[PDB]
């Protein structure tokens, strides 16, 4: 079990937990029971930006970018209600957490694209 001192400065604090390859099971939903997501974590690995159309007005593509703000990108410790709906669908209603990160990515040629990477009120 890893401590803060094991993790500090490694980059691991910006990573979401993983599950091993054996985790292919099923988690039963009792429709009479109430549920929550106690922790939602989102670790971005790629940011793509839609190029501004030259004026050809064809399909502008999403292109790769370089992250310049370092390992500061993940959303984590997010919690909320997991409702069971009458048709048996589940609805997550985000309540709180570290649910945003300012992120700056850089396009080929230098243009910097800041964004508020977020799931606020998901």
């Amino acid at each position: 079990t890893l401590t803060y001192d094991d993790i500090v400065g490694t980059g691991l604090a910006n990573k979401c937990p993983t599950l091993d390859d054996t985790a292919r099971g099923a988690y039963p939903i009792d429709s009479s029971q109430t549920y929550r997501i106690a922790r939602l974590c989102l670790q971005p690995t790629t940011f793509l930006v839609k190029e501004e159309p030259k004026n050809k007005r064809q399909e502008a593509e999403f292109v790769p970018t370089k992250l310049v703000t370092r390992e500061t990108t993940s959303l984590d410790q997010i919690q909320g209600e997991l409702k069971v709906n009458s048709d048996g669908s589940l609805t997550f209603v985000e309540e709180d957490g570290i649910d945003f990160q300012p992120v700056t990515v850089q396009m080929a040629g230098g243009e910097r694209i800041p964004l508020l990477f977020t799931v606020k009120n998901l």
């Binding site: 030259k54 004026n55 050809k56 080929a108 040629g109």
Partner: protein
């Protein structure tokens, strides 16, 4: 003395200084190529190879 249009003739019988003058000329030309490339990179818009390529 030498007329202005003959000043470089001092190099004719001086192989070492001729090599120096050639080195200087070469330095100037390579310096031009470097500077020119930099100026072009500082002005070039790479955003549209179709209707705004380098030759425009």
């Amino acid at each position: 003395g030498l007329p202005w249009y003959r000043v470089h003739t001092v190099l004719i019988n001086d192989p070492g200084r001729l090599i120096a003058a050639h080195l200087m000329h070469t330095a100037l030309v390579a310096g031009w190529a470097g500077s020119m490339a930099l100026y072009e990179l500082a002005t070039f818009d790479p955003s549209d190879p179709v209707l705004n390529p380098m030759w425009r």
